Symmetry: C4
Amino acid sequence: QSNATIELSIVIPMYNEEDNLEHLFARLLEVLTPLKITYEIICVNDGSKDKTLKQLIDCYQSNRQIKIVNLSRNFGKEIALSAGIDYAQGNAVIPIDADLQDPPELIHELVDKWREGYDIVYATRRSRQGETWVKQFTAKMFYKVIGRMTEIKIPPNTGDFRLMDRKVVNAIKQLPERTRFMKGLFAWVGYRQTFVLFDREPRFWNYWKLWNFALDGIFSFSLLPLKVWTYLGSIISLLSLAYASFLILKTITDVPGYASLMVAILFLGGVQLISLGVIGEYLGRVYEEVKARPLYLVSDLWGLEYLP
Amino acid sequence: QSNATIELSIVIPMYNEEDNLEHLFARLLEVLTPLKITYEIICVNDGSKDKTLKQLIDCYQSNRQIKIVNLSRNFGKEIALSAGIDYAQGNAVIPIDADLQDPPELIHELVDKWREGYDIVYATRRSRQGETWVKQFTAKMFYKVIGRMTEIKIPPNTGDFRLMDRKVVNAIKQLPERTRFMKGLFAWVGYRQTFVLFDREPRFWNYWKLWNFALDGIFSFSLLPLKVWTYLGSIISLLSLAYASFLILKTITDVPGYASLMVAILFLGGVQLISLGVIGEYLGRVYEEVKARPLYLVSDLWGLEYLP
Amino acid sequence: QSNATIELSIVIPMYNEEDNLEHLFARLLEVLTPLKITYEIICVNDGSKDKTLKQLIDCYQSNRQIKIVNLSRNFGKEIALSAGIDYAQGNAVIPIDADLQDPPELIHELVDKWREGYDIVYATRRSRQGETWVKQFTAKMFYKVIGRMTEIKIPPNTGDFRLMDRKVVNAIKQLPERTRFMKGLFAWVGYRQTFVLFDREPRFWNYWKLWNFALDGIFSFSLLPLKVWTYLGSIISLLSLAYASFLILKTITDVPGYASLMVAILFLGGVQLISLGVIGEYLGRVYEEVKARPLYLVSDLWGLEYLP
Amino acid sequence: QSNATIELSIVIPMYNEEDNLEHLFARLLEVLTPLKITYEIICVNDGSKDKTLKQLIDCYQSNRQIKIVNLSRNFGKEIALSAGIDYAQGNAVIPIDADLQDPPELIHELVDKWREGYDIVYATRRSRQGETWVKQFTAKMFYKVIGRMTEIKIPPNTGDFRLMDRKVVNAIKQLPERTRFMKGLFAWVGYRQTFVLFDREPRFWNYWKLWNFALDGIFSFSLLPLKVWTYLGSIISLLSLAYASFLILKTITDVPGYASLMVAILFLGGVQLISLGVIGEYLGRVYEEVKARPLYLVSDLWGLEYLP
Ligand SMILES: O=c1ccn([C@@H]2O[C@H](COP(=O)(O)OP(=O)(O)O[C@H]3O[C@H](CO)[C@@H](O)[C@H](O)[C@H]3O)[C@@H](O)[C@H]2O)c(=O)[nH]1
Ligand SMILES: O=c1ccn([C@@H]2O[C@H](COP(=O)(O)OP(=O)(O)O[C@H]3O[C@H](CO)[C@@H](O)[C@H](O)[C@H]3O)[C@@H](O)[C@H]2O)c(=O)[nH]1
Ligand SMILES: O=c1ccn([C@@H]2O[C@H](COP(=O)(O)OP(=O)(O)O[C@H]3O[C@H](CO)[C@@H](O)[C@H](O)[C@H]3O)[C@@H](O)[C@H]2O)c(=O)[nH]1
Ligand SMILES: O=c1ccn([C@@H]2O[C@H](COP(=O)(O)OP(=O)(O)O[C@H]3O[C@H](CO)[C@@H](O)[C@H](O)[C@H]3O)[C@@H](O)[C@H]2O)c(=O)[nH]1
Ligand SMILES: [Mg+2]
Ligand SMILES: [Mg+2]
Ligand SMILES: [Mg+2]
Ligand SMILES: [Mg+2]
């Protein structure tokens, strides 16, 4: 009997990953076979310029469980992962790196946690360890800032390695976004979520790129950087009128030219800052409208059918 | 004979509402039964972290009229209400609070008013009463400002407790919005509307949250905060040229350095304010386009079929 | 034999138009009957607060050719006209005012011009005449500005009275816009268009509203108000460096404090203006993208079928 | 046997092209016949005001392979090309100019390169030659700037003359854009692409229009002009506090009025520039979201079906 349904999906983005495919697939077949469930391996060749696609073709010819999504260009690891998740049909979707930095044997624990009733199972590293002190401090500050300014609780030490149930995968597909912060998106779609500790196996930064990623994470879920300027401009304006009133009082109790210039410069700056703050409020509203996030995400229903 | 049609829908958002469900449902069954019409109770469990969903399951197992929409996360009372209204199928939809702050026996008067021919029946409190003087003054000022700057007439003392006919519910579903001011939206979709006075039963503010809600209400229906800055910048620029011309006249009838600095600062500030005003005009246009409100909402038709 | 096709559609928006419906329909029946073609009258009751809808019901009960679209609220004359055009099914659509300011007997000339092969037939007044000199000057300046800054040639002295063929009506329905300048939209959708002169029959301004309408017309079809500021800021910056270099030359061939303040203020203003200009460019691009105008509008095809 | 499938499509935009249609079609029939494949000629009459459409009708009546798309207005060469590509159904689409500036006999080499396995075959001029030195320098600088600021590698000396496979045509149709930079779009959709050298046959600038085209190309694929201003404002602010601290140190080791004015002006300018930079970041995000580019473009698939 052919089940014709897939219980587990493994999404693996590739970029120049020859001489690693054999080890990858050997370890995965060693791990995914004792689970005794139907599975599929979605290898997303993300615009590699070397002999990576051909070995994927050779593997897929021999093995039915391997499926290949060949992106036209190099779109980036996150976009390749999103494409693989879009083309995955299993009940649970588990991203995996080609170099096998994250252990595959944690798939057993991920599946057990999922079967316990969780919809998201994060695979969080126990300790950063090999990361440099500068990287650790920057990551900690970034996560604290994300927690403070946003209403979203992104778990620490989380990578792409995780398990998403079919509900979460459908909800993520329900988010049309081009500037996506995947960590914040997964934490935004809040189902019953849990984490499993794992110690990265041994022997495993363009800070401009990390800064850009952090900027995307800040901007996609917080509008406060667009709201502060109204209050700052109002404060500066109020200080300007206070200074002008004090100068008038001094004149009656003449104003030097530099004092009048102070007053006018501060007032104009405050008015312009108020204008920028109002425009920033409207621009944040436009962003929230344009991102086209669903108003709500229903998890379970009693007595009703899921809306089209 | 099974009617297979629902005449009244009650949408109730929940958040940590145990030990209140029994009283809620007892009072509702006491009120909704003498109406002698088919009804349904849409309980929208809005991401409660305590034993609220389980009691809803127990109630729904015993009672067919109770339907549960379990949101994945805590999306907020307004979003839970919107989800319940989306999942309601009755001719009239009546939001209800779990704590029963608003009397359920007003549902009879709401239904009578609806049967009199109205499409929206507001349930307005006769007098704020227990509200503090600061809250009363802030609410009054907010409503006067809303009336002045917008073309929309939001009735005073209105909460979520109200009746929406199927026409109004469909029209509200026809408004794709993520930054929604529900009061302003309901007043924007203008059908035959009326109000019923009720005195809240006895024993029934994070001013930052109220300020944010007021800001959303101001920004979603008025663009004047984006239009003022053009006029302000033009006025400031005109004052700058007036001052410069007066200084030139004084020179011919030398200009001190502070006077030239005044002229240049004022002119640059006015030009920048004009630029900000033009950008604000275009941004307000972008907001109105992006909010994707329908051009018109047809209420009744003679001799024609409703367009797809 | 029932044709089951409508050859001409008359769209008439109404707002407090009692005691004029009888004269309206008498004149229309006097005009539309000698044409010997099937027609329909779409009366769009635009949220009138008096006894206008009831007389429309009485007329529609007696006459099959009268169809009523009753808007829920007062959306404005332009929006009511758009709704009536959306609900019209004739080959040619002719807007008409309720007070009969524009003669109905011009419908004969409009139909003749349409049958000559034109897709848009404007009904332009021969001379403004009764309009005040201020109104004439403002209208002329507005039309000259529209012609200069836009690539669109809006014919002068054009009102809502006109004929749109089914091709033009479909193309206009293909323009999803909430901030619509109907004159500019009709001139933007450029088919074979012509005009017919007519002298308004005898006995037939909130300048803030006219200013807002003009602002919408300017902003919906021109982006130059968002492009100028880059050039202005660059010019101001270049002047600032020129002044600073001249001051340095004077020092070597000390700079007074006011001169350094001039230099810094001008440079900062120019840099901020360049930033505003770049943001305005991107905002104009966002507007053009968001307005969702079709890339092209195909008029006639040979050897191919019209794309879905 | 009728193939009922088209192997090659030629898209030719027209604008006042009489007395050239006969030579055009003679040369094309001379070139496209030895290919021994089914073809079609899509002539997109782009709002010509002279006797161009009628000759196209006469040609299409005699020849079945000629198909005419008559645009309502003059939308521009790029938009007419896009419309023709939208209405083309061949496996390969080859844009062609009416004046035959680009040789038609290069279609043979384009087809050979396509049959070799490439999805895009650029037709690049070997040397600009007749172009003026100013034009050559401006084009070279523009292409270097495009390469530097964008991640996209637009090949040099490329015009509209090229071959797009059906995959690339479908991907381009998958890009809903109103402000389109076709060169950057084709380079953005990155398939297996190649180029063929050709020396333009003998006897074959409104710099404002070239500047606008360059501005569109810069703005549609780069957001850095919206990102720089945050860093510039932060630098200016830091300089302002440095100057203020140095002045305080000088006072303790009084500040002249011009020094305090320097400090305040620089600080306000830096704060406003930071606000403009944040707004520019959010506006670039809004642009990337609104342009509605697909997240990824899948080229080939193994073991899976193409998603709807
Ligand atoms: O453009 C692409 C397309 C696909 N992948 C795939 O993504 C997987 C893992 O990528 P990798 O770069 O090895 O991530 P990590 O091993 O977790 O470590 C990274 O840690 C930093 C940020 O996580 C990166 O800047 C470093 O390049 C990299 O060492 C692999 O299967 C790759 O093939 C990329 O990395 N980049
Ligand atoms: O995140 C959520 C999800 C659902 N609900 C439901 O909303 C209903 C009523 O909410 P409630 O907070 O009790 O509103 P009120 O009783 O009308 O009074 C409110 O008045 C203020 C603004 O109306 C709020 O800030 C106060 O928290 C609250 O006392 C209840 O069924 C709740 O379960 C919430 O309130 N918050
Ligand atoms: O909100 C609405 C809804 C519908 N209509 C209909 O529009 C038609 C004609 O409107 P009308 O105001 O009479 O336009 P005009 O007769 O052409 O003259 C106008 O000229 C100015 C701008 O055209 C307006 O400001 C003046 O109110 C008005 O006299 C009539 O059938 C009205 O019923 C409105 O005018 N306003
Ligand atoms: O509005 C339109 C509609 C269609 N076409 C068609 O486009 C084709 C080629 O256009 P053309 O202007 O001749 O381009 P080139 O021959 O490559 O040279 C151009 O080089 C510059 C930019 O490429 C232009 O500014 C010059 O007008 C023009 O000489 C022809 O079939 C035209 O009919 C236009 O050019 N403009
Ligand atoms: Mg790695
Ligand atoms: Mg309460
Ligand atoms: Mg009138
Ligand atoms: Mg040419």
